[model samples]
Target: MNNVLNSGRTTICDAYNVVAHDPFSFEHKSLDTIQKEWMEWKRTDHSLYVAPVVGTVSSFLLKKVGSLIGKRILSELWGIIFPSGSTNLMQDILRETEQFLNQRLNTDTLARVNAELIGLQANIREFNQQVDNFLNPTQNPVPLSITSSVNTMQQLFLNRLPQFQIQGYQLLLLPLFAQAANMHLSFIRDVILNADEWGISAATLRTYRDYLRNYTRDYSNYCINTYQTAFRGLNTRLHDMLEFRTYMFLNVFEYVSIWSLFKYQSLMVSSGANLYASGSGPQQTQSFTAQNWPFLYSLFQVNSNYILSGISGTRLSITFPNIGGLPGSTTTHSLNSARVNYSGGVSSGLIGATNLNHNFNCSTVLPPLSTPFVRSWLDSGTDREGVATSTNWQTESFQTTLSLRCGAFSARGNSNYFPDYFIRNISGVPLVIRNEDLTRPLHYNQIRNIESPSGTPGGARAYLVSVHNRKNNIYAANENGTMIHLAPEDYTGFTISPIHATQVNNQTRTFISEKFGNQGDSLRFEQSNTTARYTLRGNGNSYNLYLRVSSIGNSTIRVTINGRVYTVSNVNTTTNNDGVNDNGARFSDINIGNIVASDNTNVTLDINVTLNSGTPFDLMNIMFVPTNLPPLY
Candidate 1:
């Protein structure tokens, strides 16, 4: 019993030692007792038991080699020991022998095992070096332990890494970096999902999202940096021989660089390159020309007051036909024929007016020539003839010599010979006169002639002869039978010609009559007895009428001629209560005409006259006679 108990103690000690080294060795053995003992040991000292138990489990496969020895003996012993008290001792011995056999077998197998182990370790070291180079490429060489798990590293290379090189890491680090980025993204997603549990608020989530976005941006920047390095460091010379390899190996690096350039271009276009890139480098500009600015210009000039001068002369004579002499019976006679002489003067042969009067049956004879008459003949005949003829004549009929001293004609006095209208030079081109340029002068001549006829006569039967040194005056004369008639206010039915007659309000009464010649004729009211009163109606407006009449009397009148009515005050005429005609109201010595009445009267007065026999006189020509010459101011 002692031997059995002693052996059992020894065997139990060996079994415990084997179990302590190789936990896997008890897989086929009964572990009920061993577990009980282990439990008891743990109860006694849990720390000690936990260390050994965990260590034994962790190194079970490696340490199990010690059990290879006595494998067959332990199997047979285990079969017999299961049924007796000595079984525990035999089981212990069997456990020891099995452990010994396992140890021997392992020792024998070590050569092949060591070889494999060494190869695996070398591979792991190489893989670690490669991984470290990819992570920190700046280093000359990388350490090995960084990748002790060779199979895991190899799997990463095969499954996750890109086939193209980036930053010189076997063309596989691109996918690895991508995987790392994806892992980061996953971490962010997880963080957000669990944000509430982790005490994160909405603001915090937003902040974290922003942080992730910034990190992603930074990661992209890092990728760009790495790609740039790879682009620069790559062996481009190998591209031709290994074109496909170049694409497979280095395309990722090139792709990233190109993508960065594209992104930059997109940003530039979006932001308007002009604002940002202006003046940054050489560029082009544009220019302009005259076609872009189209316009035109014009100018005009005008002048006034020009002078013209010339000379003229004339003569007169009278011849008596039949005459009778008497004493107190004064014999009156008029020269039947008259001759004009303009010879021996500055301007000759211009006989304008010559009057001869002789009374045979009455008792009147020619009076002796007076100094005033002779002087008057000289001054009036020559000077008046020149002006009358020159002025009354159209430019077409007479030659005009303008003085260079006078730049433009002054619209002064009666001798207004200047053209009424003128055209200025355009484009600074002066108008040149030629000897044969009759058309040019004619054009202006027609225009002036149409406005005012030349050689217009003045007064009754008065012919405007000429204009001379008299800068702005015209003169005229007339033949006998041209004596104007004077009359009392009653004389009406006056007609300078049948076609031209002016009648008073009384159809039977005419004021002037008889057409003498183109020089003009005049007749006046011989007497006016008819008294008529007029009243003003509607609004009162005053107006005036120019008239020539012999005499007038107290007249009360209102005139309504145009659309307006005028009121006339205290009526009076050329004749007062004394019956003597006031020269102021009479038509005597009036060059143009007379003012018949100071107050308005609706009565139609006959100022114009018509002739009983002969053509109508040129009333317009006689009416507008140049007089009261304008000053040469």
Candidate 2:
């Protein structure tokens, strides 16, 4: 009767809830995990490649070629095997192939091919370096991170995932970029291995040389196209950090999807050419001969879309349930039918509202308000076997778990700086919006759907709305284009929640909250004594403090800062009727003074506020006006 060893035995759903919500429990799954999950699909694709050599090649050839292609496909998609130096291997292959063909061919046209080959070789080396730098950012001239400069692709990758908690942007580019690598390495390797076997006349040689020239140009064009989209799409809103990073994640996902559609279009065009090759002619003979040799051409034909579908699921649709705080103002989009015209950069359809996907939601991301901000490194557990284990006392219950500092960063970036700054479900439903899930539809419609956000003084003013569909509610935030700077709520003393709409100087201001109009709320100073330390970064190691607080009329708040205490009084000296409920609540900056930090790294402001009133006060946010200041509005 008493044989049960564990107290409060949990269900799978219970365990899943903990695992899903626990931030520390999450990290990108390993390559082995990817391989394990994709083995069946990889084999399936491998079998397709093997079909061309069914009767022409032996069973041994099929088995060997099948296995090799599977591994090559994985490597090509993930950039798994880049050589350390740019000086060897791939470069040598190009050189060897060039020399072998040079002696055999007798024409003045060979000189032109030779010149292009040298340039192509150099381009290959540069492209290799770019891929290397992207994968390993520490190797970059300027190591990319939050505190540092955001100059290169390496920095963007470093900032996107581990630092920011934004997913799939890195996943989007790897296959696209790796395909470029595959083009260079795989093609050259094929030429070097199969050069001696190809029986060619002068006419065939010229045709072969022409094919090489055209292929080289395609490779060059693809690389440049990828780079331009990445650079312009991401770097557009660099000055606006949250906007920039959001675009960085969204744009790549969109770009990859568009690129995949274009590839499929290209595939359709190639199919037309293949139809010509299928005719009973010399061209058909040449096309059929390539099927026997794997090295002659890549037969495993899954592109970036296949890789995306493997990691992320089939499809996703997002509902921007509110726009500009207007009731019933909503826009829902399915990445399934998302399309644009593709004749070398002419965009149409959902392309008009390209930046529409980058909406900011408070409920999904504001960890301080939504979940307990726990970065603990301790936990509760037992080593005793066959003993009665208490579920309440387990590590999952609550304790400092393992301090995971492997890729842990110190500086505040897009992830940490303004946590509630990415597009996700605004309806308070816990949904992790992934790019691959949204961009899965292979079939596209040519109809233009979403309209572009109307442009304003600062920028397009429409993206500033936060939506909640369950209640059919919406809230427009920072209409003046003011940046809502949040102080790092690292300590565990104060309470943060939505409160009544409060304003200053008769102009309605925006603060971080779940919703609006009985609207936008802030942090509450309820405890008799509270200690909250904010880590601030600045250029001159100096910062001015401006805090927005409400309902402080005729009340006193004792704030201790860096061994000095300041008595904040007369907060609502000119009390107005503009606040929530006409309760004469005053809202303005307390002018808490300034501090000069010791070094360039960061400044920690130790703040302890003692609440004198019986009722708790509300705090909007703290603005650290520095030497290198961001625009307040």
Best by lDDT, which number?
2
RMSD of each: 65.6, 27.1
Tens digits of per-residue lDDT, candidate 1, 145-249, equal: 222332354344333222222333422233224323332332343334335644446775666455444444444445544533434443322111122221221
Off by over 4 Å in 1: 1-172, 189-200, 235-633
Expressed as tens digits, the lDDT of each residue in 1-633 for candidate 2 is 000101111112232233222211111224344334333332432111111111111111111121222211212322222233232332333233234222222243334333433443444445345434644664656332211211232223322213111122322332223223333323332222223332223444344344333433343334334433444343211113222222222222222211211111001000000000000111111121111212111111111000000000011223354445454432222112122111112222332233434221111111111121122111112222223321111110111011111111121111111111111111000011123322321111112233222441111111111111100011111222111112212211111112211111211121122111111224344553444444322234444555556645344655444456666764552453122221122344455665553333333444444455544455543444442332111
Clashes (backbone N, CA, C under 3 Å), per candidate, total 79, 6
Error of 1 at 438 (Å): 84
lDDT of 2: 0.25
Candidate whose TM-score is highest:
2
Q: Predicted candidate 1: what Cα RMSD to the true structure?
A: 65.6
Worst 10 residues of 2 by lDDT: 269-278
